[PDB]
């Protein structure tokens, strides 16, 4: 149940809490304190989903939807059926995600590698907090958060967009979408380039770093380099949400009109009006 | 380029659908102050005497009123429409029955029109109704009217720039944009949907699968119809100072039942009302108005949603004078 | 009402829906997951879903077949403390020198990584005389190397440049109180204007940095040995680094 | 902290490397020049660039398309240069507003749009030959060209194939900043909410997946840069501790792992499937599905919600209702 090269890496150490007590594996999975922590919040969360589902109409997993409370309840607590389940499940989700991130730190430390992955994984946790915690706080109600259902969450995104008439004109969104597109393209390019060098076809020889740099210098007149494309990729992916967050938070608390009208700052300058 | 919190929020759909209004309190406050200028009703008067239909010589609409009531209607009408020029805006002092001044014949048609809103379009105006003031706001020219081409500013009491003037061809895209809530949509929804009843606002098929005989080549409506409907909805939204979720669950714009709010059904009646006003009362006044009031195609100024609403979901925040002025309707 | 009826009139979009899921699960389970198992499989301490070994034709002659049969040589340097498969293993000696846990190197080939035109790729600036430090950056030659304990451990003698990518990958330093140089990867180096800070290991541990067979070139296995030593230090330079932080 | 994962502390300079290809060596133009500031976060060298016929053909065809677009945009503000700069984002070149079916539209109502599209397509096709042929010239696989081909196929679907299949040029995407964006809503509305198109779902899953995968992969390689993880080619042919540690990090976290080669196949597949899934969705739209929301209702896949404000009957359906 070990990879051929794995045994030599399976030493004690690198935990943040508990020392030797949780320093072990179940099959391929490292445990650690944050492993135990994660499994607690996951077990609690999935149970509350099951309990909520049992009170609702259906057992169809694609129709299940645990929704936040009506706006009336503000930042207060709500009856379980009427949004309380939603509040409990959000706390378990945060618990599970933060546990998962800190478990990645323990694994990083045991292997003596950089902490870059758990750091990168903080970006989507932040964005979840912007949608479910920071934005609802600034508007004064948990009711502004998105519901936990596979299809119902799309209806929330849809209505949220159309509350600002045309969400495409949101400057934070324009940035976010630009990073999503260039990131998807760059992964294609990076993945394609590596495969092109290691698999040239027809029992021909594997090529070189020099071939990689030459290919892109020929095609676009620049090659960023092998290390730098990995740093760039983390940059492009991360900025999908780091720029997006400002467009989401701005919508309601810092802007109440349609997003097209925002561009009035430019269009309505007196000297060309 | 930003509006400081807090924001006022309402809920128009099931919790978790992100449906409802988003309002800046300073903006709501400024519109409330503007609309608080609605003059108060004049003191009620006892119906003492005979009907003016056999006292005065040229009363074709308000003939049932007694002298004291009729003079009250005339004092209200004057406050609402021409408070600066007074009774002589419409009247020759030497003969109060003279139709010699152009505003007189127009005022009569406007009494007919106001009574028809309050009687035939209750599905839209309910028991709030309208007075002259709803549209006119104390000036003979109502501040928010439409010609058969887009004009800026929206408020005709504001002075146009060189580029806003309809004659400057280079400002056309901006005249269109500021009528569609700053969108780039390349359609005039007033001329297309509100001037008359030629075009259908609905574009979304009511079948899952494409119906044979309306779905290929020249039998299909062009995509431009979807854009145009979108432009009407941007215009209607800005005119009422609201967003799509006031009327729709965006899940299905085309669906009624739980997928639409009662305000959407009222908006539907509003579209029919505006078309009636324009086709049967406002467009035909080009024969009765001076050249200085007409557009470049010889059209009379006409009404859209903003003419009454002026950026509020209910005109003047629901202020009524219906029970104060029953002669403006309804009329059984 | 009929037993076995579903409330579903079939249309082409419905057909293409099932087809798409089929294509996705086929590519993921039967191709991508098969490619994922080319290294470290078969498992030790199942076979029917492994692909046939892949052969690469190398740039400078020869072939390699993956997975390589080269065995793992650190087996006796760790002991099964406990009967439970999941329990961590105990080092038998100094894990930093024995090269286990985060001090582990891979059984990489004892060949000099080469440029496209057959020269050694990673060489000191005393050999690559056509290479320089860019105008504006710190020439670290002559500067002291400060270890974790604040002690000066040696002096920088050279930089090793990657001739293929035009990128410095190692510093060479004279080790104070020995006749030897050591390599350190730039990744373990804080380059200040008046010193190189190394938090990875204590000053005394620069003595046992793996030695190069040759003075002016390095093999792929040697690169791994040098790099792994410093990473070993993150957990083993002091006894309290292997212990939990909080 | 590995400061090298943030920037290059000490930059190297050396002689300009050139790898010879089977053809085209003489079509490389420019003197390479180095940028100290670029060299902090990437390679310092800018240029030279390969020209060739496909390069020049692409630039010529592309420029024609841009010129046609810019001239129609200048026409829309009647060649006032200050209004042009002001209104730029709002300006566009539109497909036909009227229904001419597949009839070639007149210049004033879609003909220019159709010409701009033809030149854009010939530009893309030329650039594809460049991306493919440069790979073959250097003895590299054509993986990039096939990823690029899926991207081009998607542009052909929204620009040309969908309009052809339903038989109207009116359905094409306008040229312009705001106008190309406005099309997204007009199209979603016409076809009953793209959230309810399963191929929109797939395409988004793969796009979000590209974010997850490049963040994870980018972060993983920086995490093992100390061990030369960035030298991905020789880690494929000769597994080092870099990719052993990378594999075990993921195996211990999620319970399974890729190889340094196979993770690039995951990346390439996810990227490709954004464009393939999107293309299938457009091909089905209007041809075989008119309203995605009602299609989901028909297959029992659309959620329902309680009333909050009262259910509102369609006024058009009431007895005595006007048209
Ligand atoms: C009508 C509605 C519109 C709309 C409304 C909209 C809104 C309201 C918001 C966006 C946002 C965004 N939109 Mg957008 N949109 C986008 C693209 C995007 C995204 C790039 C961006 C960020 C998404 C996000 O927050 O994920 C969030 C994902 C998260 C937080 C995932 C967290 C993962 C978690 C940590 C881990 C969970 C683990 C699992 C539970 C584990 C399961 C266990 C299993 C696996 C074993 C495109 C490309 C388009 C196109 C082509 O038109 C578009 C159109 C529209 N959007 C419409 C115009 N959009 C967001 C944004 O940034 O706007 C500025 C945003 O708030
Ligand atoms: C601001 C905008 C948002 C948005 C807008 C959005 C759109 C527009 C679309 C989706 C879609 C999806 N979203 Mg959603 N979303 C989802 C999850 C999902 C999936 C059900 C699906 C595919 C995502 C994917 O492949 O990503 C990449 C990740 C990959 C490839 C790794 C595998 C992830 C795995 C498939 C996730 C499975 C989640 C579980 C079913 C739920 C949790 C299970 C628990 C109870 C054990 C989560 C878990 C979250 C959280 C926790 O924040 C989230 C937040 C948001 N989404 C924001 C609210 N999302 C698509 C869909 O088809 O929905 C029907 C879709 O079209
Ligand atoms: C209200 C409107 C909506 C909408 C309408 C919409 C439509 C109409 C379509 C999409 C499509 C898609 N949407 Mg979607 N959308 C998306 C995400 C996405 C994309 C993943 C996907 C594919 C498009 C793409 O990658 O283009 C980016 C990549 C492109 C365009 C490839 C370009 C390649 C080309 C070779 C580049 C050439 C460059 C040259 C240099 C150019 C030179 C030009 C010169 C000469 C003039 C998200 C994440 C959300 C959220 C979070 O809400 C969302 C909401 C919405 N979308 C709303 C529901 N969306 C597409 C799809 O999947 O449909 C099924 C699509 O057709
Ligand atoms: C810009 C940066 C990008 C980014 C980056 C990274 N992403 C990472 C990492 C990095 C670096 C990791 O290192 C980590 C990982 O391990 O990789 C394999 C990870 C992961 N990214 C996942 C999902 C994911 N990433 C998304 C987005 C981005 N990622 C953006 C694009 C999206 C969407 C929607 O886009 C999804 C769905 C998981 C697979 C995994 C966490 C598992 C977990 O935390 O387990 C712990 C938790 C569970 C196993 C279940 C918890 C169940 C709770 C308690 C109850 C239900 C909660 C409720 C919210 C349900 C609502 C459902 C409803 C909406 C339908
Ligand atoms: C999921 C798959 C993704 C994907 C994939 C892939 N995408 C690729 C490839 C792959 C595999 C390539 O192999 C190829 C390439 O070469 O990569 C370096 C390429 C391309 N993707 C570009 C743009 C893009 N991809 C987008 C989207 C996705 N891509 C999706 C997300 C989007 C969005 C989101 O809107 C945009 C804007 C161009 C840079 C390039 C075409 C150049 C061209 O066809 O020129 C033809 C036109 C000209 C040469 C015009 C002349 C120039 C004038 C003066 C105006 C300047 C314009 C300038 C931008 C042109 C660049 C020239 C310069 C380099 C000297
Ligand atoms: C004995 C036994 C087997 C028991 C099992 C029973 C069981 C289920 C649980 C045990 C019970 C206990 C006590 C548990 C404690 C341990 C514990 C905390 C377990 C957690 C269980 C759990 C929650 C599991 C779910 C894990 C999870 C979040 C999985 C999601 C997988 C998904 C969807 C991934 C998305 C990303 C994706 C598409 C990846 C595919 C490609 C891969 C693998 C990329 C990762 C990757 C990258 C990114 C590289 O760059 C790379 C570079 C060089 C080499 C390798 C890699 C590499 O592998
Ligand atoms: C235009 C806005 C008017 C203003 C301002 C005033 N009046 Fe008027 N008046 C107007 C009309 C259209 C009519 C005909 C009404 C109808 O039912 O057809 C009238 C009528 C009169 C009369 C009756 C005169 C007669 O026919 O003999 C009187 C006495 C009268 N109006 C008086 C009056 C006064 C005193 C006003 C200022 C307070 C005033 N009118 C304003 C139109 C308009
Ligand atoms: C909106 C639905 C209106 C209501 C209610 C009333 N009026 Fe009106 N009026 C309206 C328009 C769009 C116009 C055309 C523009 C114009 O200024 O001509 C008018 C016109 C008049 C006029 C002529 C004004 C002029 O040109 O000098 C008069 C005298 C007038 N309207 C009077 C009037 C009265 C008395 C009303 C209540 C009974 C009334 N109007 C209602 C729009 C609307
Ligand atoms: C009430 C004040 C509304 C607001 C705000 C918005 N819409 Fe609307 N919409 C409304 C009505 C009454 C109608 C039907 C008009 C008719 O004559 O039948 C519509 C129609 C649409 C449609 C077309 C639906 C169809 O069946 O084809 C769409 C696509 C639509 N509306 C969208 C939309 C958007 C995006 C809005 C915010 C910008 C919006 N509407 C606002 C009523 C109201
Ligand atoms: C003056 C003649 C009007 C015109 C033109 C339009 N509307 Fe209107 N609207 C008017 C009144 C007097 C009222 C009643 C306010 C009340 O207290 O009942 C309304 C009401 C609405 C509503 C309902 C708002 C709510 O319930 O909060 C909507 C949604 C509405 N109106 C929309 C609407 C549209 C879309 C119009 C143009 C097509 C339009 N109205 C024109 C008066 C007048
Ligand atoms: C069958 C017959 C007879 C003929 C067939 C013709 C044919 C195949 C036509 C095909 C047409 C097609 C595929 C059209 C597609 C159009 C599309 C997808 C347009 C999309 C986006 C347009 C955008 C973003 C336009 C932007 C315009 C500008 C920025 C103005 C140009 C100015 C610049 C400075 C260059 C912009 C470069 C950009 C990357 C920023
Ligand atoms: C080892 O891998 C890689 C390189 O090293 C030799 C590159 O040089 C490039 C090319 C990167 C460039 C031209 C940066 C410009 C921006 C984008 C989005 C491509 C890619 C894709 C890559 O994968
Ligand atoms: C690569 C993983 C992506 C998985 C996301 C799910 C895509 C299929 C969507 C089907 C259900 C959505 N809808 C609304 C069309 O029914
Ligand atoms: Fe890589």
Numbering used by the authors:
A (entry chain LLL): 1 to 273
B (entry chain CCC): 1 to 332
C (entry chain HHH): 1 to 45, 58 to 258
D (entry chain MMM): 1 to 323
What's the publication's text?
In purple photosynthetic bacteria, photons are absorbed by the photosynthetic reaction centre (RC), which is closely related to Photosystem II but lacks an oxygen-evolving complex. The RC from Blastochloris viridis (RC vir ) was the first membrane-protein structure to be solved by X-ray crystallography and has been extensively used as a model protein for studying the light-driven charge-transfer reactions of photosynthesis. Subunits L and M of RC vir each contain five transmembrane helices that form a heterodimer supporting four bacteriochlorophyll cofactors, two pheophytins, a nonhaem iron and a tightly bound menaquinone arranged about an axis of twofold pseudosymmetry. The transmembrane domain of RC vir is capped on the periplasmic side by the single transmembrane helix-containing subunit H and is capped on the cytoplasmic side by the cytochrome subunit C, which contains four haem cofactors.
A second set of data was also collected at the SwissFEL in Switzerland in October 2019. The unit cell (a = 84.7, b = 125.1, c = 182.4 Å) is very similar to the SACLA RC vir structure and clusters with it in the internal distance-matrix analysis. In the 2.25 Å resolution structure QA could be modelled with an additional carbon in the tail of the molecule and the lipid crystal contacts between the two M subunits are more defined. Moreover, the diacyl glycerol molecule which is fused to the C-terminus of the C subunit also has poor electron density for its dual acyl tails, and only one of them is modelled in the 2.25 Å resolution structure as the remaining atoms are undefined. One potential advantage of crystallizing in LCP is the possibility of adding ubiquinone to the crystallization setup, as it easily mixes into monoolein.
